[PDB]
Amino acid sequence: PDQAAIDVNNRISAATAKLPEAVKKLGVTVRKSSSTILEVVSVYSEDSSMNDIDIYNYVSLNILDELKRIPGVGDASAIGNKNYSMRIWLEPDLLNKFGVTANDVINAVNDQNAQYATGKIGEEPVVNKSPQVISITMQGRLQTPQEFENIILRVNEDKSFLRIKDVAKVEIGAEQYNSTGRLNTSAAVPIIINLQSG
Amino acid sequence: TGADAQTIASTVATPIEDAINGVDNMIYMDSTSSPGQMKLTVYFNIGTDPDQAAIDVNNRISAATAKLPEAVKKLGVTVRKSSSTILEVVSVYSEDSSMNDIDIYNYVSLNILDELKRIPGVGDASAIGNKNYSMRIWLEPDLLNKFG
Amino acid sequence: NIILRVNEDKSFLRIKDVAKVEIGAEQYNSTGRLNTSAAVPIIINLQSGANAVNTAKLINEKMQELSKNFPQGLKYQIPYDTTIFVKASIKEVIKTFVEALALVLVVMYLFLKNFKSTIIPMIAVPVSLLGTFAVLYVLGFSINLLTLFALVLAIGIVVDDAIIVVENIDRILHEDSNISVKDAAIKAMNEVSSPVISIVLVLCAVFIPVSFISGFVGEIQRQFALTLAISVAISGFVALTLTPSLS
Amino acid sequence: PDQAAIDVNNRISAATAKLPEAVKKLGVTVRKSSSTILEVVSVYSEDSSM
Amino acid sequence: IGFIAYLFKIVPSSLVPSEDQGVIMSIINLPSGSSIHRTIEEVDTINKNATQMKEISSSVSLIGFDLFTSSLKENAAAVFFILKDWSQREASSDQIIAQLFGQYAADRNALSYFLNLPPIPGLSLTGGFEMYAQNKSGKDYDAIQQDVNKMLELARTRKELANVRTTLDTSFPQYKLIIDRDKMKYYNLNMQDVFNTISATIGTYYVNDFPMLGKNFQVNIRALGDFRNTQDALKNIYIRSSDNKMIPLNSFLTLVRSAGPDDVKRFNLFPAALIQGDPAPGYTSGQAIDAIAEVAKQSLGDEYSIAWSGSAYQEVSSKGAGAYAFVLGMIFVFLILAAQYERWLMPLAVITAVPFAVFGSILLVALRGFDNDIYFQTGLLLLIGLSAKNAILIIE
Amino acid sequence: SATIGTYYVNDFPMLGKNFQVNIRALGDFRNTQDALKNIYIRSSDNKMI
Ligand SMILES: CC[C@H]1OC(=O)[C@H](C)[C@@H](O[C@H]2C[C@@](C)(OC)[C@@H](O)[C@H](C)O2)[C@H](C)[C@@H](O[C@@H]2O[C@H](C)C[C@H](N(C)C)[C@H]2O)[C@](C)(O)C[C@@H](C)C(=O)[C@H](C)[C@@H](O)[C@]1(C)O
């Protein structure tokens, strides 16, 4: 099975270039799983103080990664796929009112919510050698929703900034609301484990 | 190049660490992200074939190569089997100081190393330095402002 | 000459006007000095399944050949060479083997009081050590410092087995005047055949669990134990078969 | 050959830093090959209409 | 046999004895953030002072690297000295270590670490534990440092362990770029363009490749070192504002002095600060392992997860197969001896023969001052084998 | 894809890991069949189409 997987990846490597940009950005995963559910593990909150999205995020951070290290587990995943993700809920009625398109939102978020490279201050070759070498650290990737709604899409003719809050609603939501996992009458993210080949 | 330790960690180590996770017979993973560079050592279980571990690591990283920033994609990630000891270390020095360190390194890389690879039993030949010939454009901010 | 911009006149603004271009290193963070002289270290990792001594000798000769063509002022040196340790260990193991063989000859000339008897260890011991080398190579084990230490150990096992066999032959020969050399040898072999097999099996069963131990210390133990078991088994076979005939 | 291809791929991986940028963009492919020509199959149109 | 137990208890236990490898590793660490030229001056003085003593023949230095934590910190340099020879040198490596230590305690300008090279490569020493404090709450590494420091302060009082050290360090100075997004958007700029300008001027920007000697070589863009050395180097940097107007970079950017960690560490996809430590004398490695685990659990709760690496991981995940195999071997030896003697009772004599050899070995190793070693156990194996062989023949 | 579907621009840092940032319109506007009547796209000129 290992040799078969290696040959499959070797043959796939060429075709990855021809794939669309989004597909390769998400990435192509090649595993040895049989796609047959070996077992289902359901994590359910008895006190119900923990919402389904937070349960899924806890699982994907703590449980799933450790499970994938266990030998004999070809692939382990959870049904919900409700991972944490900033959701910028655009309001088209408010977008057309201010004259900004979704492309203007994509460009703003891509440009501003990113981390770039900044060099160190005192570095050779220098003829006036400073006593100390100082690195430069920046933070351009916003963490809180309040920082995301302050992103400036456009500057008006005066010193008034149009921002995402005016044209959209920002909150921390699930990556996908497509699926749901239920155990008995409770809400639980199910962990499907696929047996590695051989 | 020219990125502080924290941004290198968050932007490079995290995708690679996510993709490499689940590789066959991996006991644990240790990564450090010094200024401008990110090394990730993936330890495996004893008895695992080193070449197999290397090729699986290659596949996992090739899966997530696209997620990495533009500079890291430009300077592709190198995967090597780090389980190697040093047979010997040869130092090439300019006693008269006729040549600076850059010239010594470039001459060693162009001439000396290839013959070392020719010697049977020399699986790996490397030079500690990191001075390859490069075309450096030294911008003068005053002149740039003068010419706009 | 790269044209940054084109002026209103036909003259062009170029990189030469705003910047200085030269061939420099990619990185200036590091620098290597040997004996207060600029230097560049080079590392040579030994390929798996190769000979360290031959590779080191080839590297030295190739370095000399390249140094014939070195630019003026460039000289080479080899500060670190793990081949020195293995060569010293090999020399010491050879000296230990020679000293042990000489001591065996001396002790058997003293107690047994016979000169023709000294030849028997002189053939029996090298044969079993060579067999140990052959079986070690078959199993894929490599010569290393731990293996040489275990060889120093196995020298004692082999010499002791030869001592037991030869001493038993001599003791039975001197117990009866009427008995012949071949008859004394066959009687002694009949006495100590099953015992020797018992020692061989017991020693192998002692050494095997040590190999089962995991960890880096477990593997270091496994080297010694496995070569020791190989040597005792082969020495037992040799003392069972070849030594009585020479006796 | 299965392990030979593995060794070649691992060495190219280790030397990736030495490669030029273009061949890094277009992924280098390592595949087993055979110089042997087992047979030649020729397909032809009898009616010559193709 | 009671005296055997006593002698085993009194003897120290170590994994591998320290041996002169013929060279002496010197680790030089200037204060965090020190420039490379100061490090070069320091190592030049280091080699000059090492030149006088006749025991060292040559010196090899690697300025700008940290052997302990593979890196290019410009404040750390490794200078390996090459001893003259084993035969031509009257002093052992330890005396050379002592002389170099004594030369260098006074100055305290360049920290000195003179350590003999590791007997074998990749060899854990003294069976120390490698703890990783995987932070799970996403806290900043500066807060992780204070929490981990509280952990060490609690752990120092513990009797099981001693000499705890943490690789994570936040003393390294770091200018923090504070970006006023309102002004930068006001000047009709883009963050990507201004940071390209920064990476081109202050940092090294790599654009394309140019061929020399048939090899494809990088082309790098950086401002002259004379202009970027000063803290206020931003004001000389100018970026076009997409309105054909030069906007100074210092208008919307500001450098403030701050301290940050030079090297970050992630263990198992989670930020962590590696913690090393050695067991206190008279205590096993495992006991120190549970002790430090309890200390970590007390100091950090539900926000940091413990982890193990190397020897500590092997001990934690050990299946105890060695003792089981030893029991199997003992039973097999008993059975084989009973078969040889055709009696169940008599192999007891052969077994009881080996304590004499063990007693002699442990007694001499105790008297000689040599500690329990891996090689000692290897020799004990042959000792047991030979004693058993002698006893078997006597019994037969 | 930014209004009806989900568009993954880049990642934001949270809890050490990197989590996606997804852009989508409100569920009400993409609910109906005649969703296209609400989204407007700016041309090369300033006119909204
Ligand atoms: C990089 C470049 C260096 O390679 C290493 O880092 C290797 C791989 C170290 O292990 C690496 C292993 C690694 C990576 O493990 C996580 C890390 O701990 C550091 C870098 O040492 C080894 C064995 C060192 O021992 C180490 O010396 C350090 C001062 C402390 C370390 N140990 C106490 C911690 C100890 O083992 C040792 C034998 O002295 C280095 C010898 C071979 C040299 O002189 C050569 C020239 C090295 O300087 C080097 C090739 O330039």
Residue numbers in the entry:
A (entry chain B): 100 to 297
B (entry chain C): 51 to 198
C (entry chain C): 249 to 495
D (entry chain A): 100 to 149
E (entry chain C): 546 to 941
F (entry chain B): 744 to 792
Quote the study's own text.
The most predominant and clinically important multidrug efflux system in C. jejuni is the CmeABC (Campylobacter multidrug efflux) pump, a tripartite system that includes an inner membrane transporter (CmeB), a periplasmic fusion protein (CmeA), and an outer membrane channel protein (CmeC). A recently identified CmeB variant, termed resistance enhancing CmeB (RE-CmeB), can increase its multidrug efflux pump activity, likely by influencing antimicrobial recognition and extrusion. The cryo-EM images of RE-CmeB without a bound ligand permitted us to resolve the structure of apo-RE-CmeB at a nominal resolution of 3.08 Å. This multidrug efflux pump adopts the overall architecture of RND-type proteins and forms a homotrimer. Each protomer is folded into a transmembrane domain containing 12 transmembrane helices (TM1 to TM12) and a periplasmic domain that can be divided into six subdomains (PN1, PN2, PC1, PC2, DN, and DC).
The reconstituted sample led to a cryo-EM map at a nominal resolution of 3.39 Å, thereby allowing us to obtain a structural model of RE-CmeB-Ery. In the “binding” protomer of RE-CmeB-Ery, Ery binds at a site that is distinct from, but partially overlaps with, the Cip binding site. The amino acids within 4 Å of bound Ery include K89, I136, I178, I291, M570, I572, F610, L612, F613, T614, S615, F625, L662, and P663. Most of these 14 residues are hydrophobic in nature, underscoring that drug recognition is mainly governed by hydrophobic interactions. In addition to aromatic and hydrophobic residues, it was observed that some charged and polar residues, such as K89, T614, and S615, are involved in Ery binding.
